[PDB]
C-alpha cells in the first residue's frame, strides 16, 4: 500500500495471537509495544525520545505481522504511550518513504 | 526521492535562514526544532512522546525547505533531542510510506 500522512499511520499488527493497533514510525529505530507477555528471556534496554528515557524489555526473534506482512525480529516491551513499529521491522516489510 | 529505512532518514532543511539536519518522522504529529529564533508571535505548548512531555514555543506560518521541497506550517521550538519533521509538513511535500 501507499499510506498518506494526513492522519496518523496506524495499522493493525498481530503479536502473540492478538491484534493490536500500532504506529508506523520512521523516526523510531526500534519497535516498542505496550506491556504484554512474550516468551523467552529478555535483556535490558534504555530508549530515548522527545521527553527523556524509558526502560524496556528486549525480546528477540519474535513473530509479528504488520498490516498483514510477516516479520520476525526484535520487540521492546515497556511503558511506551503508543505501540510503535520502528525501522528494524519497517525494513523487514520493505517500507520506504517517497516524495 | 525514495528513501530507504536502513538508517535514520535524516535530511537537510532550511528554516529561518539556517541550515539544519532533521529526521523525517511519520510517528510525529508536529515538527519540532532545537532552540532557534523565528519571526512572529508564539505561544507555549506541551508536547509528548516516548519519555513524557517537553515545553515548546509554537510558531505558525513558518516556511521550511525540506530536502529541496518548500512547505509552510506550524513549527515548534524547544529542547528536542533531534530536529524532527512531522506529519504537518510531510504531507505538504507529498511524502508517503510505501510497502
Amino acid at each position: 500500500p501507499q499510506i498518506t500522512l494526513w492522519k496518523r499511520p496506524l495499522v493493525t499488527i498481530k503479536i502473540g495471537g492478538q491484534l493490536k493497533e500500532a504506529l508506523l514510525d520512521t523516526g523510531a529505530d526500534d519497535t516498542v509495544i505496550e506491556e504484554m507477555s512474550l516468551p523467552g528471556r529478555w535483556k535490558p534496554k534504555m530508549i530515548g525520545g522527545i521527553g527523556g528515557f524509558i526502560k524496556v524489555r528486549q525480546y528477540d526473534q519474535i513473530i509479528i505481522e504488520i498490516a498483514g506482512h510477516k516479520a520476525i525480529g526484535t520487540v521492546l516491551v515497556g511503558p511506551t504511550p503508543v505501540n510503535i513499529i520502528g525501522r528494524n521491522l519497517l525494513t523487514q516489510i520493505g517500507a520506504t518513504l517517497n516524495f | 526521492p525514495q528513501i530507504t529505512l536502513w538508517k535514520r532518514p535524516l535530511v537537510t532543511i532550511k528554516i529561518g535562514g539556517q541550515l539544519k539536519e532533521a529526521l523525517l518522522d511519520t510517528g510525529a504529529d508536529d515538527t519540532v526544532i532545537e532552540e532557534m529564533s523565528l519571526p512572529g508571535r508564539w505561544k507555549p505548548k506541551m508536547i509528548g512522546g516516548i519519555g513524557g512531555f517537553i515545553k515548546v514555543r509554537q510558531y505558525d506560518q513558518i516556511i521550511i525547505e525540506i530536502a529541496g521541497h518548500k512547505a509552510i506550517g506550524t513549527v515548534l521550538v524547544g529542547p528536542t533531542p533531534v530536529n524532527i519533521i512531522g506529519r504537518n509538513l510531510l504531507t505538504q511535500i507529498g511524502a508517503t510510506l510505501n510497502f
Binding site: - | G27, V32, G48
Partner: peptide
C-alpha cells in the same frame, strides 16, 4: 496529548 514518537536506541 502525546504525539511525537521519535525513538532512539541507547
Amino acid at each position: 496529548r502525546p504525539g511525537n514518537x521519535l525513538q532512539s536506541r541507547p
